[PDB]
Amino acid sequence: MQIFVKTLTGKTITLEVEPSDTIENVKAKIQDKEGIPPDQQRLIFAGKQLEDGRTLSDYNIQKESTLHLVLRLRGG
């Protein structure tokens, strides 16, 4: 479904996806959209990081949910 992710700048970015799509798919969508890679993408939810292997549905996300789109701290 659709959700509303926030930026490190407190910006509002909405993304329309499916409940069957994985976090990686949603991230990939945001990538092609915004331009930020999924490798450098850090979405926080319920205090837990969105796992690619984990889908929005598996997360029981609510319509127009509030997601935190933060970058990565370190690297490797």
Side-chain angles (χ1 to χ4, degrees):
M1 66 184 76
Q2 177 181 102
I3 79 305
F4 288 59
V5 82
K6 242 204 259 228
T7 316
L8 199 68
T9 194
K11 199 170 181 83
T12 290
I13 282 64
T14 315
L15 226 307
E16 43 264 88
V17 288
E18 269 294 279
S20 62
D21 311 350
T22 37
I23 280 290
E24 61 185 308
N25 236 96
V26 191
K27 262 132 100 165
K29 218 176 172 127
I30 304 155
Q31 177 206 355
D32 223 73
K33 257 129 222 238
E34 257 298 274
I36 290 146
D39 301 283
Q40 283 133 66
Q41 212 109 238
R42 213 208 164 74
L43 316 194
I44 296 145
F45 205 120
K48 231 81 152 203
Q49 70 223 315
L50 306 180
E51 294 225 88
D52 46 293
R54 273 258 220 277
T55 47
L56 310 149
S57 184
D58 253 53
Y59 269 124
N60 207 264
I61 291 173
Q62 326 294 109
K63 53 247 167 144
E64 316 113 41
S65 45
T66 282
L67 294 81
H68 246 260
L69 157 57
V70 179
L71 273 92
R72 54 167 237 301
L73 153 47
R74 317 199 169 200

